[PDB]
């Protein structure tokens, strides 16, 4: 069996920040770009965002 990996890599966000509409819209746009197209503009996601 494996162990926990991402528990200590998670930066706790504010409640307003986690529920922000911009973040969800950006993630959904990236997912749709991945699924239907494949263009990899801004290849690194810059995990600070």
């Amino acid at each position: 069996e494996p162990e926990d990996y991402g528990s200590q890599q998670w930066a706790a966000p504010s409640l307003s920040g986690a529920a922000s509409q911009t973040v969800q819209a950006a993630y959904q746009q990236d997912l749709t770009m991945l699924g239907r197209g494949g263009v990899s503009k801004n290849l690194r996601t810059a995990n600070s965002l």
Partner: protein, 49 residues
Amino acid sequence: KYLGMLQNGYSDSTSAYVDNISTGLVVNNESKLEAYKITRVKTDDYDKN
């Protein structure tokens, strides 16, 4: 419990204490790597704020 969290350039906040911090860095004097460890004891109402 002995070493704490090894600092290697994680995300922006990520905290740094579990409740210790310890990691190695290259000394400026020469090309030898040293290791340092810092321990913190909370005080005067750290939990609030």
